Amino acid sequence: MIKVEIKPSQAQFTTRSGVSRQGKPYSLNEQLCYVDLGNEYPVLVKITLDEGQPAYAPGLYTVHLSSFKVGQFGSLMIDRLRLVPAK
């Protein structure tokens, strides 16, 4: 269904850091990817990885169901784009 591609140039993540107003230090890993939305070319999208999972290796992926949740207004939302290998 959605085609996602991690190029050889996108195999690394970068890390954002900080602290909650409640004192707690956070760390977020982000990686770029290409998502085919059916335009001329794929579009560049930023993924925030889950705690403890590595960067996705280059290759083709599709979107795992756990990426979605029902939002506070009763409509479907993406929580975090969670990927699985293509075949």
Add this chain to the structure above:
Amino acid sequence: MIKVEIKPSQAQFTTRSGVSRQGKPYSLNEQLCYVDLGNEYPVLVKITLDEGQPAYAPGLYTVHLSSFKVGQFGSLMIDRLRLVPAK
């Protein structure tokens, strides 16, 4: 990929109305559906239909690509859940 179901009880939409601060009257059609997120049972989700399209008839659907857009923070978002028939 995502399995969406319109039950016989969900074949109708309701209409919300109003006016923009800029003067313009709007009308929004909403319908309910069931989305399998892989829990025990499907979850109830509210759809806002596009201008001029009717209520989806009861049956099985999946999610059309045009439901997604890149949001203002560079991550993928759902714009409006747009459906297509299952086979």
